[PDB]
Write a protein that binds this DNA or RNA. Sequence first.
RNA 1: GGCCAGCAUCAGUUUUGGUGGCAGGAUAAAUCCAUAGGAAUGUAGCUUGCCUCGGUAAGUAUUAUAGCCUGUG
RNA 2: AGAACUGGCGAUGCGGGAUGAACCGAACGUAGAGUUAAGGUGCCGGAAUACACGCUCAUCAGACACCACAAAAGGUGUUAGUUCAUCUAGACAGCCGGACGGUGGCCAUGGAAGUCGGAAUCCGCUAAGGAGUGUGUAACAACUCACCGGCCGAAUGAACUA
RNA 3: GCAGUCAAGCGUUAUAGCGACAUUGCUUUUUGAUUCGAUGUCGGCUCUUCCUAUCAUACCGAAGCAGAAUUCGGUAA
RNA 4: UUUGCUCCACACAAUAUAGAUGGAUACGAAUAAGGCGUCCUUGUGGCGUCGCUGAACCAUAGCAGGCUAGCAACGGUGCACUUGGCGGAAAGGCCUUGGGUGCUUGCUGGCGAAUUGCAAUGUCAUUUUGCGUGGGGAUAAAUCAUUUGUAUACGACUUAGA
Lengths: 197, 137, 234, 171, 72, 191
Amino acid sequence: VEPVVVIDGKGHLVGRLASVVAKQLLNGQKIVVVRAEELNISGEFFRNKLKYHDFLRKATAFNKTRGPFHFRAPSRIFYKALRGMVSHKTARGKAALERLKVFEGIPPPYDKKKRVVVPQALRVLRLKPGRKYTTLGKLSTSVGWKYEDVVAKLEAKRKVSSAEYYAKKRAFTKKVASANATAAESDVAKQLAALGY
Amino acid sequence: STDSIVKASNWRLVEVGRVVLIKKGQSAGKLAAIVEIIDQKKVLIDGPKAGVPRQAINLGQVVLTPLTFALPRGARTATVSKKWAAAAVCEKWAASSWAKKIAQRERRAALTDFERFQVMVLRKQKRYTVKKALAKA
Amino acid sequence: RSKRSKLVTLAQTDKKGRENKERIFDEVREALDTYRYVWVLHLDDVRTPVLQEIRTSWAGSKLIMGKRKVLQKALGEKREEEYKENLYQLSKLCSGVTGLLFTDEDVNTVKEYFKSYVRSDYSRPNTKAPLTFTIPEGIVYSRGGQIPAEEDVPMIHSLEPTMRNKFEIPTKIKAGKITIDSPYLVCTEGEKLDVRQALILKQFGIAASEFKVKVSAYYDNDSSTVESTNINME
Amino acid sequence: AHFKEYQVIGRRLPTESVPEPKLFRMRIFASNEVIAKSRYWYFLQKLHKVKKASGEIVSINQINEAHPTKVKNFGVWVRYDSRSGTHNMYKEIRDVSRVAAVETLYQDMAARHRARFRSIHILKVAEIEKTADVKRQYVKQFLTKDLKFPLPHRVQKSTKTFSYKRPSTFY
Amino acid sequence: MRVRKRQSRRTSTKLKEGIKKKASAHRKKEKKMAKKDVTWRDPGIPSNFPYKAKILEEIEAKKMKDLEEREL
Amino acid sequence: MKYIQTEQQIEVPEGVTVSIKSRIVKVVGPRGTLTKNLKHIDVTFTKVNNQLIKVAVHNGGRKHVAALRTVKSLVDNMITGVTKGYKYKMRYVYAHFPINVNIVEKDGAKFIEVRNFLGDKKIRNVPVRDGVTIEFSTNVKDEIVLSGNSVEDVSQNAADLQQICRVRNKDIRKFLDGIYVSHKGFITEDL
RNA sequence: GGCCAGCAUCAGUUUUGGUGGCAGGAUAAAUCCAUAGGAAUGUAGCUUGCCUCGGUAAGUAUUAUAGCCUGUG
RNA sequence: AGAACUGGCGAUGCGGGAUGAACCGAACGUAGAGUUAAGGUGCCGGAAUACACGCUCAUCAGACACCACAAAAGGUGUUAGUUCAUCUAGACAGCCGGACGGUGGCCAUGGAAGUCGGAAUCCGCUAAGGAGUGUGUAACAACUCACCGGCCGAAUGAACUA
RNA sequence: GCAGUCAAGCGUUAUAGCGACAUUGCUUUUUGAUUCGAUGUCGGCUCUUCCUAUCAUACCGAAGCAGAAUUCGGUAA
RNA sequence: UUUGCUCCACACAAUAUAGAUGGAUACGAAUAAGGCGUCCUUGUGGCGUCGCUGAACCAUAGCAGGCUAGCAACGGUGCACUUGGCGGAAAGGCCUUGGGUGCUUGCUGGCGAAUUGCAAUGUCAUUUUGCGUGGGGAUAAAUCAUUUGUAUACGACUUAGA
Ligand SMILES: [Mg+2]
Ligand SMILES: [Mg+2]
Ligand SMILES: [Mg+2]
Ligand SMILES: [Mg+2]
Ligand SMILES: [Mg+2]
Ligand SMILES: [Mg+2]
């Protein structure tokens, strides 16, 4: 029901997340995806690397600059997985794709916003325990992405700032809960409890 | 402090006497007792107090509760009812925050328009009192 | 799939079955009626020539070996299943490698023979060391210095991996001869010996321990009671 | 479908000077009475030399489970068609009803042996009266005294597309 | 790390129709050879069933009854 | 077969304390502390008393129970390492060129330096892993001793030292020079 | 009166809920009650072994301080 | 390949099989409403990321025509079966002990003793032990396994089928 | 290739008929001695790329591989 | 190129087109584990409690929200100033100080609504390269043509000239 839905991409399966997001964009929901470098693909790392190398094989023989373009970043890998599910050569498909933003890490202003998850695409809820899986950041680094360390350092700095913010918020929440718990005996509180609130 | 320490990781156990909450079907929202284990996925349940018939059910159709009591394996419906009454399972369930949450959900769903207006008014009064108390500390 | 595969050998001797145990059972129960004194003997780690020597010296009697459980079942485990009266004590006195000696010879003669009989034996693991052994420095000989080295043939070079790995003895090969840099003490007199030390002593051929047949007790046909002998039971 | 057990009693058509033909009874698992009568005539022609056009159906009666709320161990003896010939098979099913045990067996045949309803013959379903006569480990493991087991890694079903909290698999 | 060319799994219409024709010819030849060739043309009780003794007693009783049911 | 429950036992001697939380095992004994990360296997650790620890798999298959036995063996090896230690003896032999083995310090990193293997001018260097000690033997010719609490580290260091001196492009039936592990055992020799 | 609608009562076709009365089967089987037997994945009790002051290990005991199964009504 | 008969197509649009001469459904005035066929219901894409019981992990699985590659061949992958055997007078593994005597059997060999070879391949004593299953020696020695026993204590092995 | 042999199986209650792996004979006999009818499409120059079924270069495994050289094989374009 | 160009307040004016109509409401990590509270000997610590969905939480009454009279409290909240700190991943936002000025439905009152006629989105939200009022701020280059050859088919490039 949010005007913009911010999805934390960590722990999600790429195909199922791409399917649900493509349907949301076609229905007309604005979606931002963050932390694409923490996405997961089921199956082993060598298998997924082999599939990407087959994709790398694909190219136009007489002029490589016309051929399929092999974008290495995890956000672009996810974008390819979603563009394959959107009919992107039509005006409707282009308009649906223009309701989507994908980023590595969490840049501003989304670092101060609420981030949600998609349970039907979550790895711990979908995959059977013991099945191997692949991390998108490692796959992208193996196929040529060169910004994993920069993203890691920036994410660590963001995590420190967010931990300090959460500590202050938890102290305030404890104070509010203490102030609210001492008024549970009032007649107003009894009436609200009778009505269910 | 020269003793080994291992985390327990407590789980609800599928066993005879385990109290289950049925979440779908004809008897959704009621309590029953596990009388006998059939296999990894199916058990036998009996719910004589809430009107749940003695039946074989899939474990995915119920959710285990922390409550448990003493029950012989394969006990008939009358024995299950007697043991349920002796252990007083219903009161111990009603005292839990889970059942209070269920009751609150049902009460809020059953509220009317006038009652929602009264809830808003009472919330405003409580908000004024709570904010006044909180600003001092 | 994914199981261990059993090694296949083409030999001439096949395995025994229940019929052999049945034959031993029947022979024991016939000898119980045939003879008069039934002795229980302990013969652990006995050499077959020594056992055959005992059999030859006891001509006319019977010595029956086999599975201890089979012999006890033949004698009768309890009182309601015993072949003869008060035989359950003799049956439960069996332990380990048990031999049943059926005879008509005098009790005093049997005791005298089993107290005066002894043979040299290899030192066994978990037994007291009868001597102190140290392989001398230099070329290792087959006797390891027990006899003069000039008399002794040098140790064959093929045993060097066995001495280095199994026996854990630091050895080298110089011009096809097994050599050690310093004298190697293996066992000390009056000390419990393990499997490796027993193997080293057996390989060098030192036989200073003694084998004495142990006599637990015996049962008499006419008196129908068991008398404890307590012979070589130290 | 959901199997039901029927008894079908039939006979040859009575003829001149040969009256009162002998009655034959079969216990048939089927979803309905039309299928039950078809199976009865098929098996009667396969075993005896009786044809449907020469015989008649005297009675067909549904057989209910005597104690449907009692957990039981079942031994199921079946045979199936093959190019080599007819092969026996014995299975053990822990269930509270003969029809549900038969349904479990049919699903197991469809999953493992790639078999079909018309090719599978139910020869005998017998309750194992004594626990010592059960001889399959996957059934014997549930007959142990004071049996308890957890259900680790619980997956809950969400009715909404987006969740505002990271899920937990505790139980 | 040089990945080779993968074999296609896209169905070819001509191959599919040719397979249909080849299968029909194979079935006709199998029927002809089965009719033409010259070759000569009850597993009992499974051992794992518990009440084998009861089954054997019942079938022995049935045999003993049917021995005399036709004679007299 | 999907067994309902499969378990293994781990016996803890008196001087050893073992702490387990989310499959991060810490073992403390007289000789020091060891840590293991077992988050790649789904097992449940239970404590019944201060001398026994159970490890269990619920509703598992063949690979799962194999991993269960492997986990038990790894924890037993950690306990053995903290209570007795591990000690590998290696011998180096040569035909004509005396092999020279030394301990060197390259920015405080403790390398093992091998010179004159088959007369080579190349200097071979094997780093010493953290927690293992290297000592040239007494009254034994051409012997190295590697000791430590981690059997994996000690054995891997010995394997690296053995493999750094492979003979290349020669008949190994004739050329017998090399560094070979001669003995494996424990540091403590009370009995 | 021309344009566009809204509601009500009907008619034709159709879709989707709630609720009532009957009939058959083993005149459902069950649950439940009564009665008679039986065993163990053996409840109370008893014995001995030796265990953190009695919780257990193994023999006995078929309802006892739990219960279960089968037959009949 | 040669005969007999009957269907589909040419003259024919429509739904489905991604795409199509013979495949599945269905034959056609202009429209509205309802229900379906065949095929489908993660997204492209209208329609359950439905429910339920099992199987599978593929260093380019599979989602296929049911023909061929295909020897129903190979695999210490996995699951379910069938038929035979061993088993508390002791199951599979493991460790330890025994593993003998005539005898270094006869011929041959520079040498050949169970083990380079050629033919006999026996008897005794046994719980059991081959005129020897392999390593080894110039020959012996030594080890081993065939077999038996002691400790351990509950199931296990083999051959097939899917 | 033809003709035959054997038998792990398949088949049978009529030792009929199929039949994997093996194997024999002819082609082809012992002392390393001493060109025979393509009936209708071929080869170059320049220049690019691809396959691997690898000749060389890299790294490995085996072999009476002493060394040197070489043989067989694996990954590899 | 008939005072051109640019922001700061305030009047008139129009303006809000892949689709506002209460609020995109910020820990991290694990899931065969965690969140919160509390205590100590601060740890892989003890005790208590929670989940089983956001079906939440916060806001939400007044001519689309008027005009006035009080009671209680010293709280909440809007606007324009103002104090200081933080934020560079695309920071363009987060927190905070002090007065001012309003409102307050925390509670009690009094006046007004009608006729849009029985419904018809029945129009309610930032930005405005438009003008009028005005207080302030600053007074450039590029191209053609000429010219060089480190450049060049032509364009282009590289130089120089008040
Ligand atoms: Mg590049
Ligand atoms: Mg109507
Ligand atoms: Mg759709
Ligand atoms: Mg081919
Ligand atoms: Mg190749
Ligand atoms: Mg008003």
